[PDB]
PDB file of all heavy atoms in Angstrom:
ATOM      1  N   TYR A   1     100.569  99.583  95.738  1.00  0.00           N
ATOM      2  CA  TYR A   1      99.700  98.896  96.685  1.00  0.00           C
ATOM      3  C   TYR A   1      99.413  97.473  96.232  1.00  0.00           C
ATOM      4  O   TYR A   1      98.252  97.060  96.147  1.00  0.00           O
ATOM      5  CB  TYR A   1      98.386  99.662  96.858  1.00  0.00           C
ATOM      6  CG  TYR A   1      98.470 100.841  97.797  1.00  0.00           C
ATOM      7  CD1 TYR A   1      98.598 102.130  97.307  1.00  0.00           C
ATOM      8  CD2 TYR A   1      98.412 100.661  99.169  1.00  0.00           C
ATOM      9  CE1 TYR A   1      98.674 103.212  98.158  1.00  0.00           C
ATOM     10  CE2 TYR A   1      98.488 101.737 100.030  1.00  0.00           C
ATOM     11  CZ  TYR A   1      98.616 103.008  99.519  1.00  0.00           C
ATOM     12  OH  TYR A   1      98.692 104.086 100.373  1.00  0.00           O
ATOM     13  N   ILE A   2     100.471  96.752  95.850  1.00  0.00           N
ATOM     14  CA  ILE A   2     100.325  95.316  95.468  1.00  0.00           C
ATOM     15  C   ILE A   2     101.153  94.532  96.488  1.00  0.00           C
ATOM     16  O   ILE A   2     100.932  93.311  96.629  1.00  0.00           O
ATOM     17  CB  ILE A   2     100.766  95.081  94.006  1.00  0.00           C
ATOM     18  CG1 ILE A   2      99.965  93.957  93.339  1.00  0.00           C
ATOM     19  CG2 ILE A   2     102.268  94.850  93.892  1.00  0.00           C
ATOM     20  CD1 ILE A   2     100.819  92.953  92.598  1.00  0.00           C
ATOM     21  N   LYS A   3     102.035  95.235  97.207  1.00  0.00           N
ATOM     22  CA  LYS A   3     102.836  94.585  98.277  1.00  0.00           C
ATOM     23  C   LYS A   3     102.193  94.942  99.620  1.00  0.00           C
ATOM     24  O   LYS A   3     102.896  94.897 100.647  1.00  0.00           O
ATOM     25  CB  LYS A   3     104.289  95.066  98.226  1.00  0.00           C
ATOM     26  CG  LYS A   3     105.317  93.963  98.033  1.00  0.00           C
ATOM     27  CD  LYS A   3     104.714  92.684  97.491  1.00  0.00           C
ATOM     28  CE  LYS A   3     105.731  91.784  96.827  1.00  0.00           C
ATOM     29  NZ  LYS A   3     107.115  92.154  97.203  1.00  0.00           N
ATOM     30  N   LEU A   4     100.900  95.286  99.599  1.00  0.00           N
ATOM     31  CA  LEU A   4     100.173  95.610 100.852  1.00  0.00           C
ATOM     32  C   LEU A   4     100.048  94.334 101.688  1.00  0.00           C
ATOM     33  O   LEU A   4     100.074  93.240 101.083  1.00  0.00           O
ATOM     34  CB  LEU A   4      98.799  96.188 100.505  1.00  0.00           C
ATOM     35  CG  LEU A   4      98.486  97.533 101.162  1.00  0.00           C
ATOM     36  CD1 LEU A   4      97.294  97.420 102.098  1.00  0.00           C
ATOM     37  CD2 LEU A   4      99.699  98.065 101.914  1.00  0.00           C
ATOM     38  N   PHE A   5      99.886  94.480 103.010  1.00  0.00           N
ATOM     39  CA  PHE A   5      99.819  93.314 103.932  1.00  0.00           C
ATOM     40  C   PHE A   5     101.104  92.479 103.823  1.00  0.00           C
ATOM     41  O   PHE A   5     101.143  91.424 104.484  1.00  0.00           O
ATOM     42  CB  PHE A   5      98.584  92.431 103.711  1.00  0.00           C
ATOM     43  CG  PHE A   5      97.282  93.130 103.401  1.00  0.00           C
ATOM     44  CD1 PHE A   5      96.645  92.930 102.187  1.00  0.00           C
ATOM     45  CD2 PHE A   5      96.678  93.959 104.329  1.00  0.00           C
ATOM     46  CE1 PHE A   5      95.441  93.561 101.902  1.00  0.00           C
ATOM     47  CE2 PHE A   5      95.477  94.591 104.045  1.00  0.00           C
ATOM     48  CZ  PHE A   5      94.861  94.392 102.832  1.00  0.00           C
ATOM     49  N   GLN A   6     102.057  92.864 102.966  1.00  0.00           N
ATOM     50  CA  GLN A   6     103.259  92.012 102.741  1.00  0.00           C
ATOM     51  C   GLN A   6     104.531  92.860 102.816  1.00  0.00           C
ATOM     52  O   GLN A   6     105.568  92.411 102.291  1.00  0.00           O
ATOM     53  CB  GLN A   6     103.176  91.318 101.379  1.00  0.00           C
ATOM     54  CG  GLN A   6     102.076  90.270 101.287  1.00  0.00           C
ATOM     55  CD  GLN A   6     101.955  89.693  99.897  1.00  0.00           C
ATOM     56  OE1 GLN A   6     102.684  90.068  98.983  1.00  0.00           O
ATOM     57  NE2 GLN A   6     101.023  88.769  99.730  1.00  0.00           N
ATOM     58  N   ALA A   7     104.449  94.036 103.440  1.00  0.00           N
ATOM     59  CA  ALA A   7     105.637  94.907 103.597  1.00  0.00           C
ATOM     60  C   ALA A   7     105.706  95.380 105.049  1.00  0.00           C
ATOM     61  O   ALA A   7     104.663  95.364 105.711  1.00  0.00           O
ATOM     62  CB  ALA A   7     105.545  96.070 102.640  1.00  0.00           C
ATOM     63  N   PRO A   8     106.891  95.692 105.614  1.00  0.00           N
ATOM     64  CA  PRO A   8     106.962  96.266 106.960  1.00  0.00           C
ATOM     65  C   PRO A   8     107.090  97.797 106.918  1.00  0.00           C
ATOM     66  O   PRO A   8     107.712  98.305 105.999  1.00  0.00           O
ATOM     67  CB  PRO A   8     108.255  95.634 107.495  1.00  0.00           C
ATOM     68  CG  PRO A   8     109.137  95.450 106.271  1.00  0.00           C
ATOM     69  CD  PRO A   8     108.214  95.377 105.069  1.00  0.00           C
ATOM     70  N   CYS A   9     106.484  98.507 107.878  1.00  0.00           N
ATOM     71  CA  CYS A   9     106.693  99.943 107.914  1.00  0.00           C
ATOM     72  C   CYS A   9     108.173 100.268 107.974  1.00  0.00           C
ATOM     73  O   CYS A   9     108.939  99.637 108.702  1.00  0.00           O
ATOM     74  CB  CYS A   9     105.994 100.539 109.125  1.00  0.00           C
ATOM     75  SG  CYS A   9     106.106 102.315 109.252  1.00  0.00           S
ATOM     76  N   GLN A  10     108.578 101.285 107.225  1.00  0.00           N
ATOM     77  CA  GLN A  10     109.976 101.694 107.185  1.00  0.00           C
ATOM     78  C   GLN A  10     110.334 102.654 108.298  1.00  0.00           C
ATOM     79  O   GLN A  10     111.369 103.313 108.234  1.00  0.00           O
ATOM     80  CB  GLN A  10     110.290 102.314 105.835  1.00  0.00           C
ATOM     81  CG  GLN A  10     109.820 101.492 104.686  1.00  0.00           C
ATOM     82  CD  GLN A  10     110.938 100.727 104.051  1.00  0.00           C
ATOM     83  OE1 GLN A  10     111.980 101.294 103.733  1.00  0.00           O
ATOM     84  NE2 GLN A  10     110.738  99.432 103.857  1.00  0.00           N
ATOM     85  N   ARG A  11     109.508 102.774 109.326  1.00  0.00           N
ATOM     86  CA  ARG A  11     109.867 103.611 110.452  1.00  0.00           C
ATOM     87  C   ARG A  11     109.867 102.784 111.719  1.00  0.00           C
ATOM     88  O   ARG A  11     110.798 102.858 112.523  1.00  0.00           O
ATOM     89  CB  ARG A  11     108.901 104.774 110.591  1.00  0.00           C
ATOM     90  CG  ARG A  11     108.998 105.475 111.916  1.00  0.00           C
ATOM     91  CD  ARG A  11     108.543 106.897 111.796  1.00  0.00           C
ATOM     92  NE  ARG A  11     108.909 107.688 112.961  1.00  0.00           N
ATOM     93  CZ  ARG A  11     108.123 107.855 114.011  1.00  0.00           C
ATOM     94  NH1 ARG A  11     106.933 107.282 114.036  1.00  0.00           N
ATOM     95  NH2 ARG A  11     108.520 108.592 115.029  1.00  0.00           N
ATOM     96  N   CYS A  12     108.847 101.953 111.887  1.00  0.00           N
ATOM     97  CA  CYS A  12     108.767 101.206 113.134  1.00  0.00           C
ATOM     98  C   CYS A  12     109.060  99.726 112.941  1.00  0.00           C
ATOM     99  O   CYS A  12     109.116  98.992 113.933  1.00  0.00           O
ATOM    100  CB  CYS A  12     107.391 101.372 113.768  1.00  0.00           C
ATOM    101  SG  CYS A  12     106.019 100.838 112.750  1.00  0.00           S
ATOM    102  N   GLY A  13     109.204  99.294 111.683  1.00  0.00           N
ATOM    103  CA  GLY A  13     109.486  97.875 111.383  1.00  0.00           C
ATOM    104  C   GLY A  13     108.300  96.980 111.698  1.00  0.00           C
ATOM    105  O   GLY A  13     108.421  95.756 111.495  1.00  0.00           O
ATOM    106  N   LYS A  14     107.190  97.558 112.167  1.00  0.00           N
ATOM    107  CA  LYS A  14     106.024  96.733 112.579  1.00  0.00           C
ATOM    108  C   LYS A  14     105.074  96.534 111.398  1.00  0.00           C
ATOM    109  O   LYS A  14     105.097  97.365 110.470  1.00  0.00           O
ATOM    110  CB  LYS A  14     105.284  97.379 113.755  1.00  0.00           C
ATOM    111  CG  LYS A  14     105.389  96.638 115.081  1.00  0.00           C
ATOM    112  CD  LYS A  14     105.202  95.141 114.950  1.00  0.00           C
ATOM    113  CE  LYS A  14     103.801  94.685 115.298  1.00  0.00           C
ATOM    114  NZ  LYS A  14     103.279  93.715 114.307  1.00  0.00           N
ATOM    115  N   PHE A  15     104.275  95.466 111.439  1.00  0.00           N
ATOM    116  CA  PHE A  15     103.275  95.214 110.373  1.00  0.00           C
ATOM    117  C   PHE A  15     101.929  95.766 110.838  1.00  0.00           C
ATOM    118  O   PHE A  15     101.128  96.155 109.973  1.00  0.00           O
ATOM    119  CB  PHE A  15     103.110  93.707 110.161  1.00  0.00           C
ATOM    120  CG  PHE A  15     103.771  93.144 108.929  1.00  0.00           C
ATOM    121  CD1 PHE A  15     105.151  93.066 108.835  1.00  0.00           C
ATOM    122  CD2 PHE A  15     103.012  92.671 107.870  1.00  0.00           C
ATOM    123  CE1 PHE A  15     105.757  92.537 107.705  1.00  0.00           C
ATOM    124  CE2 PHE A  15     103.619  92.143 106.742  1.00  0.00           C
ATOM    125  CZ  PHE A  15     104.990  92.077 106.662  1.00  0.00           C
ATOM    126  N   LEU A  16     101.693  95.804 112.157  1.00  0.00           N
ATOM    127  CA  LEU A  16     100.404  96.218 112.675  1.00  0.00           C
ATOM    128  C   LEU A  16     100.573  97.328 113.692  1.00  0.00           C
ATOM    129  O   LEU A  16     101.224  97.141 114.722  1.00  0.00           O
ATOM    130  CB  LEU A  16      99.681  95.032 113.307  1.00  0.00           C
ATOM    131  CG  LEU A  16      99.147  94.026 112.298  1.00  0.00           C
ATOM    132  CD1 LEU A  16      98.438  92.912 113.020  1.00  0.00           C
ATOM    133  CD2 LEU A  16      98.208  94.711 111.344  1.00  0.00           C
ATOM    134  N   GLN A  17      99.976  98.476 113.405  1.00  0.00           N
ATOM    135  CA  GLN A  17      99.758  99.514 114.392  1.00  0.00           C
ATOM    136  C   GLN A  17      98.263  99.721 114.508  1.00  0.00           C
ATOM    137  O   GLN A  17      97.621 100.137 113.538  1.00  0.00           O
ATOM    138  CB  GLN A  17     100.444 100.816 114.007  1.00  0.00           C
ATOM    139  CG  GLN A  17     101.930 100.786 114.220  1.00  0.00           C
ATOM    140  CD  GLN A  17     102.283 100.809 115.677  1.00  0.00           C
ATOM    141  OE1 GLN A  17     101.637 101.485 116.468  1.00  0.00           O
ATOM    142  NE2 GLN A  17     103.313 100.063 116.048  1.00  0.00           N
ATOM    143  N   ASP A  18      97.723  99.407 115.688  1.00  0.00           N
ATOM    144  CA  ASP A  18      96.290  99.432 115.990  1.00  0.00           C
ATOM    145  C   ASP A  18      95.493  98.557 115.035  1.00  0.00           C
ATOM    146  O   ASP A  18      94.378  98.905 114.644  1.00  0.00           O
ATOM    147  CB  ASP A  18      95.732 100.857 115.990  1.00  0.00           C
ATOM    148  CG  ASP A  18      96.490 101.772 116.911  1.00  0.00           C
ATOM    149  OD1 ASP A  18      97.428 101.290 117.583  1.00  0.00           O
ATOM    150  OD2 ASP A  18      96.157 102.975 116.966  1.00  0.00           O
ATOM    151  N   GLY A  19      96.058  97.417 114.652  1.00  0.00           N
ATOM    152  CA  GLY A  19      95.364  96.511 113.758  1.00  0.00           C
ATOM    153  C   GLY A  19      95.273  97.000 112.335  1.00  0.00           C
ATOM    154  O   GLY A  19      94.320  96.664 111.633  1.00  0.00           O
ATOM    155  N   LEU A  20      96.244  97.787 111.886  1.00  0.00           N
ATOM    156  CA  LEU A  20      96.252  98.273 110.526  1.00  0.00           C
ATOM    157  C   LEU A  20      97.571  97.909 109.873  1.00  0.00           C
ATOM    158  O   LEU A  20      98.634  98.052 110.495  1.00  0.00           O
ATOM    159  CB  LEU A  20      96.048  99.781 110.474  1.00  0.00           C
ATOM    160  CG  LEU A  20      94.643 100.253 110.810  1.00  0.00           C
ATOM    161  CD1 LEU A  20      94.619 101.749 110.894  1.00  0.00           C
ATOM    162  CD2 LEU A  20      93.703  99.782 109.755  1.00  0.00           C
ATOM    163  N   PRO A  21      97.557  97.439 108.636  1.00  0.00           N
ATOM    164  CA  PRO A  21      98.778  97.290 107.888  1.00  0.00           C
ATOM    165  C   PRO A  21      99.285  98.653 107.464  1.00  0.00           C
ATOM    166  O   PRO A  21      98.559  99.644 107.583  1.00  0.00           O
ATOM    167  CB  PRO A  21      98.330  96.456 106.688  1.00  0.00           C
ATOM    168  CG  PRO A  21      96.964  96.843 106.496  1.00  0.00           C
ATOM    169  CD  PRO A  21      96.392  97.021 107.853  1.00  0.00           C
ATOM    170  N   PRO A  22     100.586  98.833 107.055  1.00  0.00           N
ATOM    171  CA  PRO A  22     101.105 100.160 106.697  1.00  0.00           C
ATOM    172  C   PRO A  22     100.220 100.690 105.566  1.00  0.00           C
ATOM    173  O   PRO A  22      99.965  99.958 104.629  1.00  0.00           O
ATOM    174  CB  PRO A  22     102.561  99.978 106.237  1.00  0.00           C
ATOM    175  CG  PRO A  22     102.698  98.501 105.980  1.00  0.00           C
ATOM    176  CD  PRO A  22     101.716  97.861 106.935  1.00  0.00           C
ATOM    177  N   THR A  23      99.781 101.942 105.663  1.00  0.00           N
ATOM    178  CA  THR A  23      98.797 102.412 104.656  1.00  0.00           C
ATOM    179  C   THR A  23      99.348 103.512 103.743  1.00  0.00           C
ATOM    180  O   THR A  23      98.669 103.783 102.776  1.00  0.00           O
ATOM    181  CB  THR A  23      97.493 102.835 105.345  1.00  0.00           C
ATOM    182  OG1 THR A  23      97.825 103.320 106.647  1.00  0.00           O
ATOM    183  CG2 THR A  23      96.487 101.711 105.452  1.00  0.00           C
ATOM    184  N   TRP A  24     100.520 104.090 104.009  1.00  0.00           N
ATOM    185  CA  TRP A  24     101.012 105.252 103.210  1.00  0.00           C
ATOM    186  C   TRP A  24     102.223 104.859 102.351  1.00  0.00           C
ATOM    187  O   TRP A  24     103.078 104.126 102.869  1.00  0.00           O
ATOM    188  CB  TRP A  24     101.354 106.398 104.170  1.00  0.00           C
ATOM    189  CG  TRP A  24     101.948 107.617 103.537  1.00  0.00           C
ATOM    190  CD1 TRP A  24     103.270 107.896 103.350  1.00  0.00           C
ATOM    191  CD2 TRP A  24     101.224 108.752 103.033  1.00  0.00           C
ATOM    192  NE1 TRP A  24     103.419 109.116 102.748  1.00  0.00           N
ATOM    193  CE2 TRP A  24     102.181 109.665 102.543  1.00  0.00           C
ATOM    194  CE3 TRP A  24      99.867 109.079 102.943  1.00  0.00           C
ATOM    195  CZ2 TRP A  24     101.817 110.884 101.974  1.00  0.00           C
ATOM    196  CZ3 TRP A  24      99.509 110.282 102.379  1.00  0.00           C
ATOM    197  CH2 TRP A  24     100.474 111.171 101.906  1.00  0.00           C
ATOM    198  N   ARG A  25     102.305 105.333 101.096  1.00  0.00           N
ATOM    199  CA  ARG A  25     103.486 105.059 100.264  1.00  0.00           C
ATOM    200  C   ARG A  25     103.994 106.440  99.913  1.00  0.00           C
ATOM    201  O   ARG A  25     103.206 107.196  99.384  1.00  0.00           O
ATOM    202  CB  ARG A  25     103.063 104.342  98.989  1.00  0.00           C
ATOM    203  CG  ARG A  25     102.032 103.247  99.201  1.00  0.00           C
ATOM    204  CD  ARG A  25     102.464 102.077 100.059  1.00  0.00           C
ATOM    205  NE  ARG A  25     103.443 101.220  99.412  1.00  0.00           N
ATOM    206  CZ  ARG A  25     103.668  99.957  99.747  1.00  0.00           C
ATOM    207  NH1 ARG A  25     102.967  99.388 100.707  1.00  0.00           N
ATOM    208  NH2 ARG A  25     104.583  99.254  99.099  1.00  0.00           N
ATOM    209  N   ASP A  26     105.249 106.757 100.171  1.00  0.00           N
ATOM    210  CA  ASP A  26     105.672 108.163  99.972  1.00  0.00           C
ATOM    211  C   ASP A  26     105.661 108.521  98.497  1.00  0.00           C
ATOM    212  O   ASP A  26     106.090 107.717  97.682  1.00  0.00           O
ATOM    213  CB  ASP A  26     106.997 108.452 100.651  1.00  0.00           C
ATOM    214  CG  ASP A  26     107.146 109.901 101.072  1.00  0.00           C
ATOM    215  OD1 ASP A  26     106.526 110.759 100.422  1.00  0.00           O
ATOM    216  OD2 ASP A  26     107.861 110.155 102.056  1.00  0.00           O
ATOM    217  N   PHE A  27     105.161 109.705  98.176  1.00  0.00           N
ATOM    218  CA  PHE A  27     105.222 110.115  96.761  1.00  0.00           C
ATOM    219  C   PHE A  27     106.692 110.359  96.463  1.00  0.00           C
ATOM    220  O   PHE A  27     107.360 110.834  97.378  1.00  0.00           O
ATOM    221  CB  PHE A  27     104.286 111.296  96.508  1.00  0.00           C
ATOM    222  CG  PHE A  27     102.925 111.101  97.115  1.00  0.00           C
ATOM    223  CD1 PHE A  27     102.354 112.084  97.899  1.00  0.00           C
ATOM    224  CD2 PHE A  27     102.227 109.926  96.915  1.00  0.00           C
ATOM    225  CE1 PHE A  27     101.103 111.905  98.456  1.00  0.00           C
ATOM    226  CE2 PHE A  27     100.980 109.743  97.487  1.00  0.00           C
ATOM    227  CZ  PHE A  27     100.421 110.732  98.254  1.00  0.00           C
ATOM    228  N   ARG A  28     107.171 109.944  95.290  1.00  0.00           N
ATOM    229  CA  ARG A  28     108.581 110.130  94.861  1.00  0.00           C
ATOM    230  C   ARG A  28     109.419 109.028  95.497  1.00  0.00           C
ATOM    231  O   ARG A  28     110.606 108.928  95.173  1.00  0.00           O
ATOM    232  CB  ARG A  28     109.069 111.557  95.118  1.00  0.00           C
ATOM    233  CG  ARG A  28     110.146 111.704  96.183  1.00  0.00           C
ATOM    234  CD  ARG A  28     110.179 113.114  96.737  1.00  0.00           C
ATOM    235  NE  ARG A  28     109.205 113.317  97.795  1.00  0.00           N
ATOM    236  CZ  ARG A  28     109.505 113.406  99.087  1.00  0.00           C
ATOM    237  NH1 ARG A  28     110.763 113.334  99.483  1.00  0.00           N
ATOM    238  NH2 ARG A  28     108.546 113.584  99.976  1.00  0.00           N
ATOM    239  N   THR A  29     108.779 108.162  96.274  1.00  0.00           N
ATOM    240  CA  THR A  29     109.533 107.112  96.994  1.00  0.00           C
ATOM    241  C   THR A  29     108.551 106.018  97.370  1.00  0.00           C
ATOM    242  O   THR A  29     107.995 106.098  98.469  1.00  0.00           O
ATOM    243  CB  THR A  29     110.111 107.683  98.289  1.00  0.00           C
ATOM    244  OG1 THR A  29     109.407 108.896  98.545  1.00  0.00           O
ATOM    245  CG2 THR A  29     111.593 107.970  98.210  1.00  0.00           C
ATOM    246  N   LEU A  30     108.412 105.005  96.530  1.00  0.00           N
ATOM    247  CA  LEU A  30     107.371 103.995  96.745  1.00  0.00           C
ATOM    248  C   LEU A  30     107.775 103.070  97.890  1.00  0.00           C
ATOM    249  O   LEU A  30     108.116 101.900  97.709  1.00  0.00           O
ATOM    250  CB  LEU A  30     107.109 103.229  95.453  1.00  0.00           C
ATOM    251  CG  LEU A  30     106.612 104.059  94.271  1.00  0.00           C
ATOM    252  CD1 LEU A  30     106.162 103.159  93.129  1.00  0.00           C
ATOM    253  CD2 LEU A  30     105.487 104.991  94.701  1.00  0.00           C
ATOM    254  N   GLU A  31     107.735 103.635  99.092  1.00  0.00           N
ATOM    255  CA  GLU A  31     108.037 102.915 100.318  1.00  0.00           C
ATOM    256  C   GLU A  31     106.814 102.912 101.224  1.00  0.00           C
ATOM    257  O   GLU A  31     106.078 103.901 101.308  1.00  0.00           O
ATOM    258  CB  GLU A  31     109.231 103.540 101.049  1.00  0.00           C
ATOM    259  CG  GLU A  31     110.493 103.625 100.208  1.00  0.00           C
ATOM    260  CD  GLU A  31     111.572 104.466 100.865  1.00  0.00           C
ATOM    261  OE1 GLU A  31     111.230 105.489 101.496  1.00  0.00           O
ATOM    262  OE2 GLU A  31     112.763 104.104 100.747  1.00  0.00           O
ATOM    263  N   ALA A  32     106.727 101.872 102.067  1.00  0.00           N
ATOM    264  CA  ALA A  32     105.567 101.669 102.972  1.00  0.00           C
ATOM    265  C   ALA A  32     105.691 102.416 104.310  1.00  0.00           C
ATOM    266  O   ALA A  32     106.809 102.438 104.850  1.00  0.00           O
ATOM    267  CB  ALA A  32     105.487 100.184 103.229  1.00  0.00           C
ATOM    268  N   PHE A  33     104.579 102.942 104.858  1.00  0.00           N
ATOM    269  CA  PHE A  33     104.575 103.632 106.183  1.00  0.00           C
ATOM    270  C   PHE A  33     103.161 103.640 106.787  1.00  0.00           C
ATOM    271  O   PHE A  33     102.208 103.811 106.010  1.00  0.00           O
ATOM    272  CB  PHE A  33     104.932 105.116 106.047  1.00  0.00           C
ATOM    273  CG  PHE A  33     106.226 105.436 105.344  1.00  0.00           C
ATOM    274  CD1 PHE A  33     106.226 105.923 104.048  1.00  0.00           C
ATOM    275  CD2 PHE A  33     107.444 105.267 105.984  1.00  0.00           C
ATOM    276  CE1 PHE A  33     107.415 106.218 103.400  1.00  0.00           C
ATOM    277  CE2 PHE A  33     108.632 105.557 105.332  1.00  0.00           C
ATOM    278  CZ  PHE A  33     108.616 106.037 104.044  1.00  0.00           C
ATOM    279  N   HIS A  34     103.015 103.490 108.114  1.00  0.00           N
ATOM    280  CA  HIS A  34     101.688 103.629 108.746  1.00  0.00           C
ATOM    281  C   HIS A  34     101.527 105.144 108.721  1.00  0.00           C
ATOM    282  O   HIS A  34     102.535 105.825 108.938  1.00  0.00           O
ATOM    283  CB  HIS A  34     101.740 103.165 110.201  1.00  0.00           C
ATOM    284  CG  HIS A  34     102.039 101.721 110.392  1.00  0.00           C
ATOM    285  ND1 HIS A  34     101.099 100.746 110.172  1.00  0.00           N
ATOM    286  CD2 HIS A  34     103.156 101.096 110.809  1.00  0.00           C
ATOM    287  CE1 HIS A  34     101.629  99.574 110.432  1.00  0.00           C
ATOM    288  NE2 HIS A  34     102.890  99.756 110.823  1.00  0.00           N
TER     289      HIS A  34
END
């Protein structure tokens, strides 16, 4: 969570869903997701 506000969701490619930056990082896979 140091690349927060600075990564795109890996499912929708969007930065904002309902005014939220991607908030989930998969365990075993440090990737961003709303």
Side-chain angles (χ1 to χ4, degrees):
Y1 280 100
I2 212 227
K3 239 18 159 17
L4 233 243
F5 321 117
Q6 292 175 0
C9 183
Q10 311 258 310
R11 165 154 193 268
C12 59
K14 249 316 261 135
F15 256 70
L16 287 181
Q17 285 289 322
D18 306 358
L20 288 173
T23 30
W24 176 268
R25 317 297 289 202
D26 208 332
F27 314 130
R28 113 202 84 106
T29 17
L30 299 190
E31 303 170 322
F33 305 105
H34 296 284

